[PDB]
Design a protein around this motif. Structure first.
Motif, PDB file in Angstrom:
ATOM      1  N   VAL A   1      55.822 103.692   9.090  1.00  0.00           N
ATOM      2  CA  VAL A   1      56.730 104.388   9.985  1.00  0.00           C
ATOM      3  C   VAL A   1      56.492 103.849  11.385  1.00  0.00           C
ATOM      4  CG1 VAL A   1      55.149 106.277  10.349  1.00  0.00           C
ATOM      5  CG2 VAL A   1      57.579 106.688  10.631  1.00  0.00           C
ATOM      6  N   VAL A   2      57.543 103.780  12.162  1.00  0.00           N
ATOM      7  CA  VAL A   2      57.420 103.429  13.560  1.00  0.00           C
ATOM      8  C   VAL A   2      57.292 104.727  14.326  1.00  0.00           C
ATOM      9  CG1 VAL A   2      58.540 102.319  15.486  1.00  0.00           C
ATOM     10  CG2 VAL A   2      58.724 101.342  13.220  1.00  0.00           C
ATOM     11  N   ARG A   3      56.307 104.809  15.213  1.00  0.00           N
ATOM     12  CA  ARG A   3      55.999 106.068  15.889  1.00  0.00           C
ATOM     13  C   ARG A   3      56.995 106.271  17.030  1.00  0.00           C
ATOM     14  NH1 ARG A   3      52.723 104.019  12.032  1.00  0.00           N
ATOM     15  NH2 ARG A   3      50.947 105.370  11.510  1.00  0.00           N
ATOM     16  N   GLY A   4      58.235 106.508  16.643  1.00  0.00           N
ATOM     17  CA  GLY A   4      59.339 106.666  17.565  1.00  0.00           C
ATOM     18  C   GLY A   4      59.960 105.341  17.941  1.00  0.00           C
ATOM     19  N   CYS A   5      61.259 105.376  18.210  1.00  0.00           N
ATOM     20  CA  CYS A   5      61.973 104.147  18.507  1.00  0.00           C
ATOM     21  C   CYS A   5      61.797 103.688  19.948  1.00  0.00           C
ATOM     22  CB  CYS A   5      63.454 104.310  18.176  1.00  0.00           C
ATOM     23  SG  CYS A   5      64.319 105.473  19.209  1.00  0.00           S
ATOM     24  N   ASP A   6      60.831 104.249  20.674  1.00  0.00           N
ATOM     25  CA  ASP A   6      60.376 103.644  21.918  1.00  0.00           C
ATOM     26  C   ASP A   6      59.828 102.257  21.676  1.00  0.00           C
ATOM     27  OD1 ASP A   6      60.977 105.876  23.400  1.00  0.00           O
ATOM     28  OD2 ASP A   6      59.004 106.782  23.055  1.00  0.00           O
ATOM     29  N   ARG A   7      59.118 102.080  20.573  1.00  0.00           N
ATOM     30  CA  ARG A   7      58.452 100.824  20.293  1.00  0.00           C
ATOM     31  C   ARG A   7      59.401  99.713  19.899  1.00  0.00           C
ATOM     32  NH1 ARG A   7      52.841 101.473  19.531  1.00  0.00           N
ATOM     33  NH2 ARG A   7      52.275 103.645  20.000  1.00  0.00           N
ATOM     34  N   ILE A   8      60.703  99.966  19.838  1.00  0.00           N
ATOM     35  CA  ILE A   8      61.652  98.924  19.497  1.00  0.00           C
ATOM     36  C   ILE A   8      62.660  98.718  20.615  1.00  0.00           C
ATOM     37  CG2 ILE A   8      63.334  98.160  17.851  1.00  0.00           C
ATOM     38  CD1 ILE A   8      60.527  98.210  16.814  1.00  0.00           C
ATOM     39  N   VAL A   9      63.404  99.761  20.960  1.00  0.00           N
ATOM     40  CA  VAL A   9      64.502  99.621  21.911  1.00  0.00           C
ATOM     41  C   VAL A   9      64.273 100.515  23.123  1.00  0.00           C
ATOM     42  CG1 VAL A   9      66.133  98.933  20.190  1.00  0.00           C
ATOM     43  CG2 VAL A   9      65.799 101.304  20.624  1.00  0.00           C
ATOM     44  N   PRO A  10      64.781 100.160  24.290  1.00  0.00           N
ATOM     45  CA  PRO A  10      64.596 101.037  25.451  1.00  0.00           C
ATOM     46  C   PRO A  10      65.566 102.201  25.487  1.00  0.00           C
ATOM     47  CG  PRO A  10      65.690  99.012  26.089  1.00  0.00           C
ATOM     48  CD  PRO A  10      65.313  98.840  24.665  1.00  0.00           C
TER      49      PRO A  10
ATOM     50  N   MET B   1      74.222 102.833  21.006  1.00  0.00           N
ATOM     51  CA  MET B   1      73.749 103.064  19.655  1.00  0.00           C
ATOM     52  C   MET B   1      73.049 104.408  19.622  1.00  0.00           C
ATOM     53  SD  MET B   1      71.355 100.647  17.316  1.00  0.00           S
ATOM     54  CE  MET B   1      69.961 100.749  18.424  1.00  0.00           C
ATOM     55  N   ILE B   2      73.269 105.169  18.564  1.00  0.00           N
ATOM     56  CA  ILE B   2      72.564 106.423  18.375  1.00  0.00           C
ATOM     57  C   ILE B   2      71.540 106.180  17.281  1.00  0.00           C
ATOM     58  CG2 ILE B   2      72.723 108.831  18.008  1.00  0.00           C
ATOM     59  CD1 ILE B   2      75.620 108.729  18.650  1.00  0.00           C
ATOM     60  N   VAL B   3      70.291 105.965  17.671  1.00  0.00           N
ATOM     61  CA  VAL B   3      69.213 105.940  16.698  1.00  0.00           C
ATOM     62  C   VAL B   3      69.058 107.343  16.147  1.00  0.00           C
ATOM     63  CG1 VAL B   3      66.789 105.554  16.349  1.00  0.00           C
ATOM     64  CG2 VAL B   3      68.060 104.066  17.825  1.00  0.00           C
ATOM     65  N   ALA B   4      69.272 107.497  14.852  1.00  0.00           N
ATOM     66  CA  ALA B   4      69.226 108.816  14.257  1.00  0.00           C
ATOM     67  C   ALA B   4      68.476 108.741  12.948  1.00  0.00           C
ATOM     68  CB  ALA B   4      70.619 109.384  14.022  1.00  0.00           C
TER      69      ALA B   4
ATOM     70  N   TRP C   1      73.668 101.332  26.199  1.00  0.00           N
ATOM     71  CA  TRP C   1      72.599 102.306  26.216  1.00  0.00           C
ATOM     72  C   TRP C   1      72.190 102.545  24.780  1.00  0.00           C
ATOM     73  CZ3 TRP C   1      76.801 102.529  29.275  1.00  0.00           C
ATOM     74  CH2 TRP C   1      76.573 102.512  30.647  1.00  0.00           C
ATOM     75  N   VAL C   2      71.167 103.361  24.600  1.00  0.00           N
ATOM     76  CA  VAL C   2      70.790 103.818  23.276  1.00  0.00           C
ATOM     77  C   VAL C   2      70.151 105.187  23.437  1.00  0.00           C
ATOM     78  CG1 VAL C   2      68.664 102.512  23.345  1.00  0.00           C
ATOM     79  CG2 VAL C   2      69.546 103.228  21.190  1.00  0.00           C
ATOM     80  N   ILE C   3      70.480 106.084  22.520  1.00  0.00           N
ATOM     81  CA  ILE C   3      70.102 107.480  22.617  1.00  0.00           C
ATOM     82  C   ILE C   3      69.359 107.862  21.343  1.00  0.00           C
ATOM     83  CG2 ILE C   3      72.361 108.264  21.796  1.00  0.00           C
ATOM     84  CD1 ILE C   3      72.150 110.563  23.728  1.00  0.00           C
ATOM     85  N   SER C   4      68.259 108.582  21.500  1.00  0.00           N
ATOM     86  CA  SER C   4      67.355 108.875  20.394  1.00  0.00           C
ATOM     87  C   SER C   4      67.671 110.264  19.876  1.00  0.00           C
ATOM     88  CB  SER C   4      65.905 108.790  20.825  1.00  0.00           C
ATOM     89  OG  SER C   4      65.042 109.236  19.805  1.00  0.00           O
ATOM     90  N   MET C   5      68.643 110.337  18.991  1.00  0.00           N
ATOM     91  CA  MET C   5      68.909 111.580  18.301  1.00  0.00           C
ATOM     92  C   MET C   5      67.795 111.850  17.317  1.00  0.00           C
ATOM     93  SD  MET C   5      72.219 112.362  16.075  1.00  0.00           S
ATOM     94  CE  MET C   5      72.503 113.870  15.183  1.00  0.00           C
TER      95      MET C   5
END
Ligand code: SF4
Lengths: 47, 170
Positions: B123-132, B77-80, B103-107
């Motif tokens: 707002v979520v302070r980056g998608c670290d707090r949800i998915v690895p 998944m591309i979190v974008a 995997w998941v990549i933080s675009m």
């Protein structure tokens, strides 16, 4: 992780927010400024 | 058992079994590298750039990337774009129905550590707090060159997956 869901916990920051409007002049440095009121619709002076 | 043993980052094939396992691992990682199916998650200023990779200047079909926008067929998944409070359970749920070699990549810069909205309320302070997330793609318009480079970084990680070599438990 343990609730297998997201939870809503109260606020904790890594970095505290920093505004910088504490450095500010009290009087607004813009002047009074002229008008554009029409000569019809401002009050006529006496005499 | 030996008191000294080479780290799995440092080991070389020496048994003929290891040559067989390493070539089989290379075939598995290689099919995982070429065929490469992300899912269209993109939602904001960080989604047009995902479409810019599909544009005919910086093609992804020549890389094998194609957007099966259906998370059960997706490898990664591309979190974008930015990530809001209101959305985030849907992000978790889309992460849930993905197959296991994922995997998941933080675009995008909002997608890691909040970005430009780090001090907003919803707002979520980056998608670290949800998915690895394993690779970050920095850049607030995170460049197509940079996004592809993030994919190549991830593919190097895919070359070092060692799914076969760990049956020997190296
Ligand atoms: S990376 Fe940039 S364009 Fe994308 S959500 Fe963040 S601020 Fe917006």
């Amino acid at each position: 992780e343990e609730k297998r869901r997201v939870v809503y916990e109260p606020l904790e920051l890594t970095q505290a927010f920093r505004n910088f409007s504490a450095g500010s002049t009290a009087w607004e440095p813009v002047g009074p400024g002229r008008d554009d009121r029409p000569d019809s619709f401002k009050l006529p002076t006496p005499k | 058992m030996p008191t000294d043993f080479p780290l799995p980052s440092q080991q070389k094939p020496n048994s003929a079994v290891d040559y067989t396992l390493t070539t089989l691992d290379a075939v598995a990682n290689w099919a995982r590298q070429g065929s490469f199916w992300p899912v269209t998650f993109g939602l904001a200023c960080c989604a047009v750039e995902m479409m810019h990779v599909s544009a005919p200047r910086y093609d992804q079909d020549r890389l094998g990337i194609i957007f099966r926008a259906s998370p059960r067929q997706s490898d990664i998944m591309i979190v974008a774009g930015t990530l809001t409070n209101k959305m985030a359970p849907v992000l978790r749920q889309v992460y849930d129905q993905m197959p296991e070699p994922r995997w998941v990549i933080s675009m995008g810069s909002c997608a890691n550590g909040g970005g430009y909205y780090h001090f907003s309320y919803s707002v979520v302070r980056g998608c670290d707090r949800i998915v690895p997330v394993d690779v970050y793609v920095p850049g607030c318009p995170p460049t197509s060159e940079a996004l592809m480079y993030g994919v190549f970084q991830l593919q190097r990680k895919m070359r070092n997956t060692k799914i076969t070599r760990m049956w020997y438990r190296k």
